Structures are given as C-alpha cells and as structure tokens.
DNA sequence: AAAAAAAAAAAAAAAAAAAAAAAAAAAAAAAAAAAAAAAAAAAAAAAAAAAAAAAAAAAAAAAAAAAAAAAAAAAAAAAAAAAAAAAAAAAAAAAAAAAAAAAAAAAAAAAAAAAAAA
C-alpha cells in the first residue's frame, strides 16, 4: 500500500536481468553499509545458466 | 521646492549552502626507538732516537722505438640565428595594533500612582 493508502507500489520488481550484481550499488546505512561493484551481464547471465 | 536613489508589489531568468549515516584514504601532528655528536676518564701504537747497513742513481755507450716532415683525406667543433628553463627585482597584500562611536548598568531624586489611617 501506498503511504496515503490511496494507491500501490510493487514490493518487488519481477526483474529478469541479475540487477544487483550488474549495476552494482551503493548506500550508507545506521549500521551496515553496502558497497556492490558493476559486473558485466554476459558474464553474469553464463554463471546463472 | 527641485533632483536622485531605495523599497515594495508579481510573473520571469539564473544560482548557492549546512548537517546525518559507514568505510576508506590522505595530511598532519605527536611519543619513542635509534643512531650521530660531544664531554670526560684510562689507556697503548707511533715518533723519536740511535747505530748500522746495502739498493738504485751516476757513468760509459750501442740501438731501436720514436716525434717531426710530407701527404691525403674525414669531418669534430665554433660562432651565428632561434627557441625554452629557471632565478632576483620590484610591487602588492591580509591580519593586526590603534583609534573612535554606540549599548548596558548605574543609582539621585521626583511625578504619578496605590493604599490605608482617623
């Protein structure tokens, strides 16, 4: 639900490319922090299959 | 009383800055090992000193590698043009001590007010 209430967001995309791994991320949390670097997505897709 | 400049209304153009949160690097300032340098002790190889000696400069003189002369030929270096690197000369500057103008505390004394006595 939306913060409102009045709409809906998706929890999570049904993504088909491995998202995280190709174009990385990044972000500073309270606690932990994340720090993901780019892969290529060939490469990537060859290590799924 | 004339001139000039600020400011404010509302639709337009265009910008700037402070912090949180984690993880890594880069400056920049300290204790603290670690070795030069220096003062002040005892200690010990070198100059002195002397007598005694024999190894290399003189001297004779031949001769054999030599330095000047002659010639031919190759082409390194010097001086004149330009084009870059790197350092004193001179002038400028931002904090920084000096001076001057405005805000807060001070009481002396009185106007106006509030309150109560007989």
């Given at each position: ?36 670097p ?12």
């Amino acid at each position: 639900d939306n913060y409102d209430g009045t709409e809906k967001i998706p929890d999570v995309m049904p993504t088909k490319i491995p998202n995280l791994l190709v174009n990385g991320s990044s972000g500073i949390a309270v606690g932990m922090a994340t720090n993901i670097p780019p892969h290529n997505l060939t490469e990537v897709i060859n290590g799924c299959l």
